[PDB]
Coordinates of C-alpha atoms in Angstrom, one line a residue:
Chain A
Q1 CA 49.2 27.1 43.0
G2 CA 48.3 24.3 40.0
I3 CA 51.5 21.9 40.0
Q4 CA 51.9 22.2 43.6
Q5 CA 48.1 20.8 44.4
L6 CA 48.8 18.2 41.7
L7 CA 52.0 17.0 42.9
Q8 CA 49.9 16.8 46.3
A9 CA 47.0 14.7 44.2
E10 CA 50.0 12.8 42.9
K11 CA 51.3 12.1 46.2
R12 CA 47.9 10.9 47.3
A13 CA 47.5 8.7 44.4
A14 CA 50.9 7.0 45.1
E15 CA 49.7 6.4 48.7
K16 CA 46.1 5.1 47.7
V17 CA 47.7 2.7 45.1
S18 CA 50.6 1.5 47.9
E19 CA 47.6 0.9 50.2
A20 CA 45.9 -1.4 47.6
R21 CA 48.9 -3.3 47.5
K22 CA 48.4 -4.0 51.4
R23 CA 44.7 -4.4 51.8
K24 CA 43.7 -7.8 50.5
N25 CA 47.0 -9.1 51.9
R26 CA 46.0 -8.6 55.4
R27 CA 42.4 -10.3 54.4
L28 CA 44.5 -13.0 52.9
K29 CA 46.4 -13.7 56.8
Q30 CA 43.2 -13.2 58.3
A31 CA 41.5 -16.0 56.2
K32 CA 43.7 -18.4 58.3
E33 CA 42.0 -16.9 61.4
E34 CA 38.3 -16.8 60.5
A35 CA 39.1 -20.5 59.3
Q36 CA 39.5 -21.4 63.1
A37 CA 36.6 -19.2 64.3
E38 CA 34.4 -21.1 62.0
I39 CA 35.7 -24.6 62.7
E40 CA 35.4 -24.4 66.6
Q41 CA 31.7 -23.6 66.4
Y42 CA 31.2 -26.4 63.8
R43 CA 33.1 -28.9 66.0
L44 CA 31.0 -28.0 68.8
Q45 CA 27.8 -28.4 66.6
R46 CA 28.8 -31.9 65.4
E47 CA 29.9 -33.0 68.9
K48 CA 26.3 -31.7 70.5
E49 CA 24.6 -33.6 67.6
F50 CA 26.6 -36.9 68.4
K51 CA 26.1 -36.3 72.1
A52 CA 22.2 -36.0 71.7
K53 CA 22.6 -39.3 69.5
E54 CA 24.4 -40.6 72.5
Chain B
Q1 CA 40.7 27.0 38.1
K2 CA 38.6 23.8 37.0
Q3 CA 41.3 22.3 34.7
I4 CA 43.7 22.2 38.0
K5 CA 40.9 20.2 40.0
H6 CA 40.3 18.1 36.7
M7 CA 44.0 17.1 36.9
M8 CA 43.9 16.5 40.6
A9 CA 40.9 14.3 40.3
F10 CA 42.8 12.5 37.1
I11 CA 46.1 11.8 38.8
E12 CA 44.0 10.3 41.7
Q13 CA 41.9 8.3 39.2
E14 CA 45.2 7.2 37.8
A15 CA 45.4 5.7 41.1
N16 CA 41.9 4.6 41.7
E17 CA 42.0 2.3 38.5
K18 CA 45.2 0.6 39.5
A19 CA 43.9 0.1 43.1
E20 CA 40.7 -1.1 42.0
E21 CA 42.8 -3.7 39.7
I22 CA 45.1 -4.6 42.8
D23 CA 41.9 -5.3 44.8
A24 CA 40.2 -7.3 42.2
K25 CA 43.1 -9.4 41.4
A26 CA 43.6 -10.4 44.6
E27 CA 39.9 -10.6 45.8
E28 CA 39.8 -14.0 44.9
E29 CA 43.0 -15.2 46.9
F30 CA 41.5 -14.4 50.3
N31 CA 38.2 -16.1 49.3
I32 CA 40.2 -19.3 48.4
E33 CA 42.4 -19.3 51.5
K34 CA 39.4 -19.0 53.7
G35 CA 37.5 -21.6 51.7
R36 CA 40.2 -24.1 51.3
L37 CA 40.8 -24.1 54.8
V38 CA 37.1 -24.2 55.9
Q39 CA 36.0 -26.9 53.6
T40 CA 39.3 -29.1 54.6
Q41 CA 38.6 -28.8 58.4
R42 CA 34.8 -29.4 57.9
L43 CA 35.1 -32.4 56.1
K44 CA 37.5 -34.3 58.6
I45 CA 35.4 -33.0 61.5
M46 CA 32.1 -34.2 59.9
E47 CA 33.6 -37.7 59.2
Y48 CA 35.2 -38.1 62.8
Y49 CA 31.8 -37.5 64.5
Chain C
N1 CA 36.6 13.1 32.6
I2 CA 33.1 14.7 32.6
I3 CA 32.1 13.6 36.0
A4 CA 35.1 15.1 37.7
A5 CA 35.1 18.2 35.5
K6 CA 31.5 19.0 36.7
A7 CA 32.4 17.8 40.3
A8 CA 34.7 20.7 40.3
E9 CA 32.1 23.2 40.0
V10 CA 29.4 21.4 42.0
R11 CA 31.7 21.1 45.2
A12 CA 31.5 25.0 45.0
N13 CA 27.6 24.8 44.5
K14 CA 26.7 25.6 48.4
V15 CA 23.1 25.9 49.3
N16 CA 20.7 28.2 51.0
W17 CA 19.2 25.1 53.3
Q18 CA 17.0 27.7 55.4
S19 CA 15.2 28.5 52.2
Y20 CA 14.2 25.1 51.1
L21 CA 13.2 24.4 55.0
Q22 CA 11.2 27.7 54.9
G23 CA 9.6 26.5 51.6
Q24 CA 9.0 23.4 53.6
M25 CA 10.7 21.0 50.7
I26 CA 13.0 19.5 53.4
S27 CA 12.4 18.7 57.5
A28 CA 14.4 20.4 60.2
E29 CA 16.1 17.2 60.7
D30 CA 17.5 17.1 57.2
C31 CA 18.5 20.7 57.0
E32 CA 20.3 20.7 60.6
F33 CA 22.1 17.5 59.3
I34 CA 23.5 18.6 56.2
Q35 CA 24.3 22.1 58.0
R36 CA 26.5 20.2 60.4
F37 CA 27.9 17.9 57.8
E38 CA 28.9 21.0 56.0
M39 CA 30.3 22.5 59.3
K40 CA 32.7 19.2 59.7
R41 CA 35.8 20.2 57.9
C42 CA 37.6 16.6 56.7
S43 CA 37.0 13.2 56.6
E44 CA 37.5 12.2 60.1
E45 CA 35.5 15.2 61.2
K46 CA 32.9 13.4 58.9
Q47 CA 33.7 10.1 60.7
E48 CA 32.7 11.7 63.9
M49 CA 29.5 12.9 62.1
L50 CA 28.6 9.3 60.9
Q51 CA 29.4 8.0 64.6
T52 CA 27.0 10.6 66.3
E53 CA 24.4 10.6 63.7
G54 CA 24.9 7.8 60.9
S55 CA 21.2 6.8 60.5
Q56 CA 20.2 10.4 60.4
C57 CA 23.1 10.8 57.8
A58 CA 21.8 8.2 55.6
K59 CA 18.0 9.2 56.2
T60 CA 19.0 12.8 55.2
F61 CA 21.0 12.3 51.9
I62 CA 17.8 10.1 50.8
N63 CA 15.6 12.7 51.8
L64 CA 17.7 15.5 50.1
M65 CA 17.8 13.5 46.8
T66 CA 14.1 12.7 46.9
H67 CA 12.2 15.6 47.8
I68 CA 14.2 18.6 46.3
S69 CA 13.1 19.4 42.9
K70 CA 16.4 21.2 41.7
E71 CA 18.9 18.9 39.6
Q72 CA 21.9 20.7 40.6
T73 CA 21.0 20.7 44.4
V74 CA 20.6 16.9 44.1
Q75 CA 23.8 16.7 42.2
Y76 CA 25.5 18.6 45.0
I77 CA 24.0 16.1 47.6
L78 CA 24.7 13.1 45.2
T79 CA 28.5 14.5 45.2
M80 CA 28.8 15.2 48.9
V81 CA 27.8 11.2 49.4
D82 CA 29.7 10.1 46.6
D83 CA 32.9 12.2 48.0
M84 CA 31.8 10.6 51.5
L85 CA 32.0 7.1 50.0
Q86 CA 35.0 7.6 48.2
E87 CA 37.0 8.8 51.7
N88 CA 36.0 5.2 52.9
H89 CA 33.9 2.5 51.1
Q90 CA 33.0 0.8 54.4
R91 CA 30.3 3.6 54.8
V92 CA 27.8 2.0 52.8
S93 CA 26.9 -0.3 55.6
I94 CA 25.4 2.9 57.3
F95 CA 22.9 3.3 54.4
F96 CA 22.0 -0.6 54.7
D97 CA 21.4 -0.2 58.2
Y98 CA 19.2 2.8 57.8
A99 CA 17.4 0.9 55.2
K100 CA 17.0 -2.1 57.5
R101 CA 15.8 0.2 60.2
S102 CA 13.3 1.4 57.6
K103 CA 12.1 -2.3 57.0
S104 CA 13.4 -2.2 53.4
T105 CA 16.4 -3.2 51.3
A106 CA 18.4 -0.2 49.9
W107 CA 17.6 -0.1 46.3
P108 CA 14.3 1.6 46.2
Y109 CA 15.9 4.8 47.8
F110 CA 18.4 5.3 45.1
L111 CA 17.2 3.5 41.8
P112 CA 14.5 6.2 41.1
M113 CA 17.0 8.8 40.8
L114 CA 18.2 7.2 37.4
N115 CA 15.3 9.0 36.1
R116 CA 16.9 12.4 37.1
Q117 CA 16.4 15.3 34.6
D118 CA 20.1 16.3 34.4
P119 CA 22.8 13.9 33.0
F120 CA 25.3 14.6 35.9
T121 CA 22.4 13.6 38.7
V122 CA 21.6 10.3 36.9
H123 CA 25.6 9.5 36.4
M124 CA 26.0 10.4 40.1
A125 CA 23.0 8.6 41.4
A126 CA 24.4 5.5 39.0
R127 CA 28.0 6.0 40.9
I128 CA 26.2 5.7 44.4
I129 CA 24.3 2.7 43.1
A130 CA 27.3 1.0 41.8
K131 CA 29.2 1.8 45.1
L132 CA 26.6 0.4 47.1
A133 CA 26.0 -2.6 44.9
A134 CA 29.6 -3.4 44.6
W135 CA 30.9 -3.1 48.6
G136 CA 27.5 -3.8 50.3
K137 CA 27.0 -7.0 52.2
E138 CA 23.2 -6.6 50.8
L139 CA 23.4 -7.3 47.0
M140 CA 21.0 -6.3 44.1
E141 CA 18.7 -8.8 42.3
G142 CA 16.2 -9.3 39.5
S143 CA 14.0 -6.4 38.5
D144 CA 16.5 -3.9 40.4
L145 CA 19.5 -5.3 39.0
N146 CA 18.2 -5.6 35.5
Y147 CA 16.5 -2.0 35.6
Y148 CA 20.2 -0.7 36.6
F149 CA 22.2 -2.6 33.9
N150 CA 18.9 -1.4 31.4
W151 CA 20.1 2.1 32.4
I152 CA 23.8 1.3 31.9
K153 CA 23.1 -0.2 28.4
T154 CA 21.2 2.8 27.6
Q155 CA 24.1 4.9 28.4
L156 CA 26.6 2.8 26.5
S157 CA 24.0 3.0 23.5
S158 CA 24.6 7.1 23.5
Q159 CA 27.5 6.8 21.0
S160 CA 32.6 13.1 22.0
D161 CA 30.5 13.9 25.1
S162 CA 28.6 10.7 25.1
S163 CA 31.9 8.5 25.1
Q164 CA 33.4 11.0 27.8
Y165 CA 30.4 10.2 29.9
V166 CA 30.4 6.8 29.2
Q167 CA 33.9 6.5 31.1
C168 CA 31.7 7.1 34.3
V169 CA 29.4 4.2 33.0
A170 CA 32.4 2.0 32.5
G171 CA 33.3 2.8 36.0
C172 CA 30.0 1.9 37.3
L173 CA 29.5 -1.1 35.2
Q174 CA 33.5 -2.6 36.7
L175 CA 32.0 -1.6 40.2
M176 CA 29.2 -3.9 39.3
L177 CA 31.3 -6.8 37.8
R178 CA 33.2 -6.9 40.9
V179 CA 30.2 -9.0 42.1
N180 CA 29.8 -12.5 40.5
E181 CA 25.9 -12.7 40.1
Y182 CA 26.0 -9.4 38.4
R183 CA 27.9 -10.8 35.4
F184 CA 25.6 -13.4 34.6
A185 CA 22.6 -10.8 34.9
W186 CA 24.8 -8.5 32.5
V187 CA 25.3 -11.5 29.9
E188 CA 21.2 -12.1 30.3
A189 CA 21.0 -8.3 29.5
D190 CA 23.4 -9.1 26.7
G191 CA 25.3 -6.1 27.4
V192 CA 28.7 -7.2 26.5
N193 CA 27.7 -6.4 23.0
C194 CA 27.8 -2.8 23.9
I195 CA 31.2 -3.0 25.5
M196 CA 32.5 -4.8 22.4
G197 CA 30.6 -2.1 20.5
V198 CA 32.8 0.9 22.2
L199 CA 36.0 -1.3 21.6
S200 CA 34.8 -1.7 18.0
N201 CA 34.5 2.1 17.6
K202 CA 38.1 2.6 18.4
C203 CA 37.6 4.5 21.8
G204 CA 40.4 6.5 23.3
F205 CA 42.8 4.6 25.8
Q206 CA 40.7 5.7 28.9
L207 CA 37.4 3.5 27.7
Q208 CA 40.1 0.9 26.2
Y209 CA 41.1 0.0 29.9
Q210 CA 37.9 0.6 31.3
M211 CA 35.8 -1.4 28.7
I212 CA 38.6 -4.4 28.9
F213 CA 38.6 -4.2 32.7
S214 CA 34.8 -4.7 32.5
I215 CA 35.6 -8.0 30.2
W216 CA 38.4 -9.0 32.5
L217 CA 36.0 -8.8 35.3
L218 CA 33.4 -10.9 33.3
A219 CA 36.1 -13.5 32.8
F220 CA 36.4 -14.3 36.3
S221 CA 34.1 -17.3 36.2
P222 CA 34.8 -20.5 34.0
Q223 CA 30.8 -20.8 33.4
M224 CA 31.2 -16.9 31.9
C225 CA 34.5 -17.8 29.9
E226 CA 32.3 -20.9 28.7
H227 CA 29.6 -18.6 27.3
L228 CA 31.5 -15.2 26.4
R229 CA 32.7 -16.8 23.2
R230 CA 30.2 -15.7 21.0
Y231 CA 30.4 -11.7 21.5
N232 CA 33.7 -12.1 19.4
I233 CA 35.9 -10.2 21.9
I234 CA 39.4 -11.5 21.4
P235 CA 39.9 -9.8 18.1
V236 CA 38.9 -6.0 19.6
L237 CA 41.2 -7.1 22.6
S238 CA 44.1 -8.2 20.1
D239 CA 43.4 -4.9 18.0
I240 CA 44.1 -2.7 21.1
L241 CA 46.9 -5.1 22.2
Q242 CA 48.5 -4.0 18.7
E243 CA 47.1 -0.3 18.6
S244 CA 47.6 0.6 22.3
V245 CA 50.9 0.0 24.2
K246 CA 49.7 2.1 27.1
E247 CA 51.0 0.4 30.4
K248 CA 47.2 0.0 32.1
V249 CA 45.7 -1.3 28.7
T250 CA 48.5 -3.7 27.8
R251 CA 48.0 -5.1 31.5
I252 CA 44.3 -5.4 31.5
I253 CA 44.0 -7.3 28.0
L254 CA 46.8 -9.6 29.5
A255 CA 44.7 -10.0 32.4
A256 CA 41.3 -10.6 30.4
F257 CA 43.2 -12.9 28.0
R258 CA 44.6 -14.8 31.2
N259 CA 41.4 -15.3 32.9
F260 CA 39.3 -16.3 29.6
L261 CA 42.1 -18.9 29.0
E262 CA 43.0 -20.0 32.8
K263 CA 39.3 -20.0 34.0
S264 CA 38.5 -22.2 30.8
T265 CA 38.1 -25.5 32.8
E266 CA 36.6 -26.9 29.8
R267 CA 39.6 -28.1 27.5
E268 CA 37.8 -27.2 24.3
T269 CA 37.3 -23.6 25.5
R270 CA 40.9 -23.3 27.0
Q271 CA 42.0 -24.8 23.5
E272 CA 39.8 -22.2 21.6
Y273 CA 40.7 -18.9 23.6
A274 CA 44.3 -20.1 23.1
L275 CA 43.4 -20.6 19.5
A276 CA 41.4 -17.3 18.8
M277 CA 44.4 -15.3 20.4
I278 CA 46.8 -17.3 17.9
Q279 CA 44.4 -16.6 15.0
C280 CA 44.6 -12.8 16.0
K281 CA 48.4 -13.9 16.3
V282 CA 48.6 -12.2 19.7
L283 CA 51.8 -14.3 20.4
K284 CA 54.1 -12.5 18.2
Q285 CA 52.4 -9.1 19.9
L286 CA 53.4 -10.7 23.4
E287 CA 56.8 -11.1 22.1
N288 CA 57.2 -7.5 21.2
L289 CA 55.6 -6.6 24.6
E290 CA 58.1 -8.7 26.2
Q291 CA 60.9 -7.1 24.5
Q292 CA 59.2 -3.4 25.2
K293 CA 60.0 -1.9 28.6
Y294 CA 57.6 -2.2 31.2
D295 CA 58.2 -2.0 35.1
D296 CA 55.3 -4.1 36.4
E297 CA 55.3 -8.0 37.0
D298 CA 51.5 -8.2 36.3
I299 CA 52.5 -7.2 32.7
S300 CA 55.6 -9.5 32.6
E301 CA 54.3 -12.6 34.2
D302 CA 51.0 -12.6 32.3
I303 CA 52.8 -12.2 29.0
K304 CA 54.9 -15.1 29.8
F305 CA 51.9 -17.1 30.8
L306 CA 50.1 -16.2 27.6
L307 CA 53.1 -17.0 25.5
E308 CA 53.4 -20.5 27.1
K309 CA 49.4 -21.1 26.5
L310 CA 49.6 -19.8 23.1
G311 CA 52.7 -21.5 22.5
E312 CA 50.4 -24.8 22.3
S313 CA 48.0 -23.2 19.8
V314 CA 50.6 -21.7 17.5
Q315 CA 51.4 -25.5 16.7
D316 CA 48.1 -26.2 16.0
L317 CA 47.4 -22.8 13.7
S318 CA 50.9 -23.1 11.9
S319 CA 49.9 -26.6 10.4
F320 CA 48.5 -26.8 7.1
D321 CA 45.7 -25.7 9.4
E322 CA 46.5 -22.0 8.7
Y323 CA 44.5 -22.9 5.2
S324 CA 41.7 -24.8 7.5
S325 CA 41.4 -21.4 9.6
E326 CA 41.4 -19.2 6.4
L327 CA 38.5 -21.3 5.0
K328 CA 36.5 -21.4 8.3
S329 CA 37.0 -17.6 8.8
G330 CA 36.5 -17.0 4.9
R331 CA 39.7 -15.2 4.6
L332 CA 40.5 -16.9 1.3
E333 CA 43.5 -15.0 -0.3
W334 CA 46.8 -15.7 -2.4
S335 CA 48.5 -16.8 0.8
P336 CA 51.8 -19.0 1.0
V337 CA 49.3 -22.1 2.2
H338 CA 47.0 -21.8 -0.7
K339 CA 50.1 -20.9 -3.3
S340 CA 52.6 -23.7 -1.8
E341 CA 52.3 -27.0 -4.0
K342 CA 53.7 -29.1 -0.8
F343 CA 50.2 -28.8 1.0
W344 CA 48.1 -30.0 -1.6
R345 CA 50.7 -32.7 -2.6
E346 CA 50.5 -34.0 1.1
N347 CA 46.8 -33.0 2.3
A348 CA 44.6 -32.6 -0.8
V349 CA 41.9 -35.4 0.3
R350 CA 41.5 -33.8 3.6
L351 CA 39.1 -31.2 1.7
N352 CA 36.5 -34.4 2.3
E353 CA 36.8 -33.6 6.3
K354 CA 34.1 -33.1 8.9
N355 CA 31.6 -34.2 6.2
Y356 CA 32.9 -32.2 3.2
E357 CA 33.1 -28.9 5.4
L358 CA 36.1 -27.6 3.3
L359 CA 34.6 -28.4 0.0
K360 CA 31.2 -27.1 1.1
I361 CA 33.1 -23.6 2.2
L362 CA 34.7 -23.6 -1.3
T363 CA 31.4 -24.5 -2.9
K364 CA 29.7 -21.8 -1.0
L365 CA 32.2 -19.2 -1.7
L366 CA 32.4 -20.1 -5.3
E367 CA 28.2 -19.9 -5.2
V368 CA 27.7 -16.5 -3.2
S369 CA 31.2 -14.6 -2.8
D370 CA 31.6 -11.2 -4.4
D371 CA 35.6 -11.3 -4.3
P372 CA 37.3 -12.2 -7.7
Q373 CA 40.4 -13.1 -5.5
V374 CA 38.1 -15.6 -3.4
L375 CA 36.7 -16.8 -6.3
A376 CA 39.9 -17.3 -8.5
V377 CA 41.7 -18.6 -5.0
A378 CA 38.8 -21.0 -4.7
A379 CA 39.2 -22.3 -8.4
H380 CA 42.8 -22.4 -7.9
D381 CA 42.1 -24.5 -4.7
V382 CA 40.0 -26.9 -6.9
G383 CA 42.5 -27.1 -9.7
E384 CA 45.3 -28.4 -6.8
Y385 CA 42.5 -30.4 -5.0
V386 CA 42.0 -32.4 -8.1
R387 CA 45.6 -32.5 -9.7
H388 CA 46.9 -34.0 -6.1
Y389 CA 43.6 -36.0 -5.1
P390 CA 42.2 -38.0 -8.4
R391 CA 38.9 -38.9 -6.6
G392 CA 38.4 -35.2 -5.7
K393 CA 37.5 -35.1 -9.5
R394 CA 34.5 -37.6 -8.9
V395 CA 33.7 -36.0 -5.6
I396 CA 33.5 -32.3 -7.1
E397 CA 31.6 -34.0 -10.0
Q398 CA 28.9 -35.7 -7.5
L399 CA 28.8 -32.3 -5.5
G400 CA 27.9 -30.5 -8.8
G401 CA 30.8 -27.9 -7.7
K402 CA 32.0 -27.9 -11.5
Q403 CA 29.0 -25.8 -12.6
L404 CA 30.5 -22.7 -10.4
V405 CA 33.8 -23.1 -12.2
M406 CA 32.2 -23.4 -15.4
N407 CA 30.1 -20.4 -15.1
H408 CA 33.0 -18.4 -13.8
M409 CA 34.6 -18.8 -17.1
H410 CA 32.6 -16.0 -18.2
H411 CA 33.2 -14.1 -14.8
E412 CA 34.1 -10.3 -15.3
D413 CA 37.5 -10.7 -13.9
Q414 CA 40.4 -12.0 -16.2
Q415 CA 41.9 -13.4 -12.9
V416 CA 38.8 -15.5 -12.1
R417 CA 38.4 -16.5 -16.0
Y418 CA 41.9 -17.7 -15.8
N419 CA 41.7 -19.8 -12.8
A420 CA 38.3 -20.9 -13.7
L421 CA 39.8 -22.1 -17.2
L422 CA 42.8 -23.5 -15.2
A423 CA 40.6 -25.6 -12.9
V424 CA 38.5 -26.7 -16.0
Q425 CA 41.9 -28.0 -17.8
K426 CA 43.1 -29.7 -14.6
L427 CA 39.1 -31.5 -14.1
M428 CA 38.8 -32.5 -17.7
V429 CA 42.2 -32.7 -19.2
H430 CA 45.0 -35.2 -18.0

């Protein structure tokens, strides 16, 4: 029992820290994509302000 | 029994600690990359209109 | 340690919910949910339960913590949510959705459980609060934030059982310090004194890591790095950096030291962190740790970073200013820079610098020090000051510092009496 369940917990531990080396790297790519969705809405808002002034 | 489950929780904690450290050290880089691009483009677009 | 060891019992502490329902202590909705949640076998089957009954889940957990009298049933309920949030951190959003449906912030449903009568209940309540507060879109504020920090500060003040419970308190405090404004609120609670105190109490490597991780998280902000200097934290990290070569402990000190120095946008503060590490002689230990086998780039590259930056302030300290620091710190000794003629022969006049600061230090030490070495060293320092800077005689005579030396001619120590006489010789005899 004991060492087998401990090695399974060690395998889960190794997987959990391996996923931590990936989590924020996916968010760091998506930062480049969220920085397009934010930008088109702002470009549209600034054009609407300009067109209202025109 | 309890000592086995304690060691299992300990070896997963021995990853949880690294995992929190890795999440926290990388947390800033995602925030910087979004903020950098957002400020850069919102300044250009402000001045254009 | 303690929380995992108790949870290994409390996960087996299954409950007769029909008895609490018959006793009217719970609703049929709470009873049915916790029964269905106990029947759903694994984290995916709990995700199906959250997908079908997620608001009723948050309702049930809050109810079964609130309305149950018995501490160990509340700990079982706390253990079940603590594990449910361990399976996926995103699930905190379901409790905030339930709080918003309840026309409330989340915190009033959880903060009352910090008053619970069994220590495991309050620590598990603190884990839930820390998980919500770290991972939520909604954040703690004001009296709620300060109250939970006053609970944390109270548990840190409990100093092996207290120290081993405080591992959970440190983990909860690290979870809090993931959020920026909570760092300022903890510094306003002044709670870094307690972190520094645990590290000053020479705690085990688990607490060394968790407390220095709390300090590393505190050091993420330039405005925090400007302020954190008053806690005297670089010496306790530098002690652990010598006393504890453990891979995690090594890495989190290097991380804390890198954050303090690199986030100091103020050049004076940057120089001061680099120099405080050099007054702790950290750079030599970083070279020892560069030669030691480590498999981690987050050790190796932060060693080389600090070796470069402390590679500036080593040049500042290794001046004659190793004497300046021995005066500033009050570490007067028969050191090589006190003993060597070259220093005085080239620099003795500098005792007048910063509006006579070094003279004022030596005078104060000759006035109020208990240590005959310090007194004799200071008398020797006065002897060489007058020997190598003749106007220094007039300055000691104008400051009246001679009176201390002339009194210490009858000091209880022959080393002091000798150095006092020798200073009187160098003061009055050509």
